[PDB]
Amino acid sequence: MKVILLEPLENLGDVGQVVDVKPGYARNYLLPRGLAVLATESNLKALEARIRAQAKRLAERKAEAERLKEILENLTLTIPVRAGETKIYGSVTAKDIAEALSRQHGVTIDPKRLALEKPIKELGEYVLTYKPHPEVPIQLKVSVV
């Protein structure tokens, strides 16, 4: 008796799994408790259709992390802080780094998917990273004026 799963369980689990059981088991537990459905081709083909959708649909927003790595991974920022020497008077949070970058080139960024703890407050040279999954570290230059 071929059936497709939902909630994973013991000795038969992961959703989409297609497994054979004894009809009694199917008819009096799984199907009624809603822990499976019949392996009809009716459903069996609509399962492949759920995968072929979600699976490749998700590699759109993986190829879209690279459609934005291939542009900022190299490009430089340069930030005009009013400092004195090595130390700065104010700081430089993301609300600026994400911001400046947007109006310096036209690029929107989440100030949250960065890679920053403390807000710099220190003149020099850095390159922090970005997110999600496989990543893009953006390149930034502090300054004076």
Added chain:
Amino acid sequence: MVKIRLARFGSKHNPHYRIVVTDARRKRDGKYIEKIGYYDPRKTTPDWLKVDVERARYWLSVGAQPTDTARRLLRQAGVFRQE
């Protein structure tokens, strides 16, 4: 001039005022002349407002401006009302 208005008490995120008569030049929560009521603007009780209406009448009778947001509340306990 001399006034009727609200002075914070309570805690953070727990507003809790006392209706009170005072010189305007005082600091918000400073020394006041006299207490006449209290008021919980979260109404977390059957008593979320009280007023010695008797007295409220006195201070008005001898010249005293209440705040906008104070006036509301003395009206709402019928101090102005004349039958």
Added chain:
RNA sequence: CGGGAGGCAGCAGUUAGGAAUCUUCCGCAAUGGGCGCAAGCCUGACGGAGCGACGCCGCUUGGAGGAAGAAGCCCUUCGGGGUGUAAACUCCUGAACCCGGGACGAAACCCCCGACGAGGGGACUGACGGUACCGGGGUAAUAGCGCCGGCCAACUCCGUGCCAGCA
């Protein structure tokens, strides 16, 4: 080259000193203040957020079984004794995270009836914040410091030899 400019013991910040003491943040929505008949304008006061076990309070790193008692290490009268139900292992609960929904604080000023009054009715407005909190799903998931001669609660082995050290 005749003369000019400045006074953070206001908010935040730099420097110096020192054992040592924070953000160049958000908002006038709430309260309070100034001017204005009013609409409203200003308010680093205030209402909030950020940083620090600095303190007080609450909460977690698991619950129930489980050997006449694994190994490892320590003692030993070499029979054993100790860590110790502790662990392994078995079920059962489900901090974090995940998806959804999401405030109270805000009813006045102002507009209509009455009279711009007493009284009645009607509308705008939330920085914190998609944050608390509610509902569904959901992984066994940080421990360290001080002391064990008497005062003073907790003893045995080795090392050391008025040295090294403790107080």
